[PDB]
């Protein structure tokens, strides 16, 4: 059903749509804090061994 | 804004005058649309002062 039935907004532009949609989720810090977390994860196993 | 733009010509090194963020188009602008053409017009006439 999802393959056979799909439509667009009636007059859309596919750069305005994305410059509006992708914008608010690029003020997060979890994508950096996981990089902080992987340091502790990698150093703890070296301290253990 | 017009008289402050004229007064800013004297104090070039201390203060600089720019057009606001909100006077630009939404995101990009899409020449397809009509309102952003007039936005471009207003901006391109305001900028040389």
């Amino acid at each position: 059903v999802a393959l056979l039935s799909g439509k667009y907004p009636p007059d859309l532009v596919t750069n305005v749509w994305y410059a509006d949609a992708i914008y608010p989720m690029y003020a997060d810090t979890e994508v950096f804090s996981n990089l902080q977390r992987d340091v502790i994860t990698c150093e703890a196993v070296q301290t253990l061994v | 804004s017009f008289r402050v733009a004229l007064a800013g010509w004297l104090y070039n090194g201390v203060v600089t005058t720019v057009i606001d963020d909100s006077s630009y188009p939404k995101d990009g602008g899409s020449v397809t649309s009509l309102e952003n053409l007039w936005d471009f017009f207003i901006l391109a006439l305001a900028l040389p002062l």
Partner: peptide
């Protein structure tokens, strides 16, 4: 007057831009 009372009913019946749509709107 009735001239205003009918106009308010016409405005109550007949009620509610050219831009590319965004995900907010």
């Amino acid at each position: 007057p009735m001239s205003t009372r009918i106009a308010e009913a016409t405005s109550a019946i007949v009620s509610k831009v050219g831009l590319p749509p965004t995900a907010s709107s």
